[PDB]
Amino acid sequence: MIFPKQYPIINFTTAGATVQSYTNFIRAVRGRLTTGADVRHEIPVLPNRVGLPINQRFILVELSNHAELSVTLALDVTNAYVVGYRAGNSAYFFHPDNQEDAEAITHLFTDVQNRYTFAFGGNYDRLEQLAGNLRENIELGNGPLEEAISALYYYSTGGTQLPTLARSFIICIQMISEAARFQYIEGEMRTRIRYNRRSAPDPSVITLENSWGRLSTAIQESNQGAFASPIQLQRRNGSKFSVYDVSILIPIIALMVYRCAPPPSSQF
Numbered sequence: 001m002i003f004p005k006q007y008p009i010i011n012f013t014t015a016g017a018t019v020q021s022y023t024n025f026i027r028a029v030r031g032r033l034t035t036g037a038d039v040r041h042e043i044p045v046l047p048n049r050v051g052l053p054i055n056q057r058f059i060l061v062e063l064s065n066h067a068e069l070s071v072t073l074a075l076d077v078t079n080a081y082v083v084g085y086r087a088g089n090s091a092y093f094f095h096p097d098n099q100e101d102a103e104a105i106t107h108l109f110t111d112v113q114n115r116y117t118f119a120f121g122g123n124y125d126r127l128e129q130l131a132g133n134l135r136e137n138i139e140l141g142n143g144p145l146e147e148a149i150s151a152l153y154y155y156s157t158g159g160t161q162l163p164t165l166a167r168s169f170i171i172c173i174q175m176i177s178e179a180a181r182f183q184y185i186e187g188e189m190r191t192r193i194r195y196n197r198r199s200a201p202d203p204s205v206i207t208l209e210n211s212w213g214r215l216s217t218a219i220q221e222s223n224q225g226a227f228a229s230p231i232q233l234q235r236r237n238g239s240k241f242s243v244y245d246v247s248i249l250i251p252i253i254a255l256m257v258y259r260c261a262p263p264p265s266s267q268f
């Protein structure tokens with residue numbers, strides 16, 4: 001007996017990765033995260049957690065290595081968060097935020113021999129504390145991802161120190177979840193992969209990561225696209241960039257988290 005259906009799996013390898021293979025991967029992850037039910041100002045909205053059936057709650061991302069290793073991350077479709085991962089006979093899950101998330105995570109990697117829930121959550125602030133470094137000091141790119149896949153794979157066996165496991169999650173979340181959320185961050189990772197040059201994310205990337213929920217809510221609560229209150233982001237060089245409307249964000253944000261219902265007047 002195997003419980004009805006099965007979450008979707010998207011594969012990516014860092015071995016010989018190119019801009020095109022990375023673009024294909026991120027497009028595929030977006031396609032499994034969204035349903036097409038909810039698009040506002042041309043920007044797709046992730047499924048609403050309220051009423052979402054457990055059989056539609058996750059996607060799997062199977063990462064492989066030039067080292068020939070594989071780990072599978074589980075993403076929550078409601079927010080694209082990595083909630084845990086499987087390496088061979090062990091799975092690890094971040095500490096759940098609430099009871100409903102704790103139950104949901106029992107539906108993942110159900111026949112793994114060994115199941116662990118970390119005592120810590122998987123938010124960036126907690127993972128930065130564990131890593132002993134901020135996102136701004138952690139290089140991203142294909143080399144970092146290849147290294148992170150091996151670090152997650154060896155964690156079971158004591159090969160990987162906790163600070164290196166936290167830094168590995170930080171790499172994976174930005175190169176998969178944040179790239180799915182933001183075409184701008186997908187483009188930043190494509191640049192690092194094209195030239196095979198790792199580099200830490202600049203303030204444009206960090207301020208978008210830090211503002212995804214505020215931007216989703218500003219767009220969803222806007223009056224015909226116009227924000228009641230501007231949001232300040234940073235350009236590459238750190239200078240302030242004020243966002244007053246959804247229009248400037250159409251090339252930048254690919255997916256929003258559900259924040260409010262769309263008022264009458266739009267997907268019809």
Ligand SMILES: Nc1nc(=O)c2ncc(C(=O)N[C@@H](CO)C(=O)N[C@@H](Cc3c[nH]c4ccccc34)C(=O)O)nc2[nH]1
Pocket residue numbers: 079080081082083094122123124125173177178209210211212213257
């Ligand atoms: N494991 C993990 N997978 C992710 O994709 C991820 N992506 C982003 C963050 C992160 O700290 N985000 C900041 C900026 O939004 C935050 O304050 N997160 C809070 C609040 C929050 C929870 N769920 C959300 C969904 C959307 C926006 C914000 C939130 C948190 O994780 O507790 N952490 C992640 N951790």
